[PDB]
């Protein structure tokens, strides 16, 4: 018998909901219009770090996730500081739409 490749996700758009704690959301973000791309020539906003046992890890966020939208705010063409401000002022529940590649 020879092995068959198992099912395999190549790309994925997700909606995740982070519950903020006193220490914050447990993520770092990188990139943005006007600053140095996180990845190739893509100027979008990216998750650069996830705290191992933090709120975002619990909610399933992963390093490399591209941030598309936060509580109804679209991040297309957002500057780095604009995405930071949207996130610091997102409140208790931070629901985000992300793009995830393998």
């Amino acid at each position: 018998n020879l092995l068959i490749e198992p099912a395999r996700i190549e790309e994925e758009e997700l909606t995740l909901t982070i519950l903020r704690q006193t220490g914050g959301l447990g993520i770092s973000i990188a990139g943005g219009k006007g600053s140095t791309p996180y990845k190739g020539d893509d100027e979008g906003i990216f998750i650069s770090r996830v705290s191992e046992e933090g709120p975002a890890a619990r909610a399933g966020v992963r390093v490399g996730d591209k941030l598309l939208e936060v509580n109804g705010v679209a991040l297309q063409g957002a500057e780095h500081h604009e995405a930071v401000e949207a996130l610091r002022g997102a409140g208790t529940a931070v629901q985000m739409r992300v793009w995830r590649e393998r």
Binding site: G24, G26, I27, S28, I29, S35, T36, Y38, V84
Partner: peptide
């Protein structure tokens, strides 16, 4: 420069 990083 390196890309910017902000902790949240």
């Amino acid at each position: 420069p390196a890309w910017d990083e902000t902790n949240l």
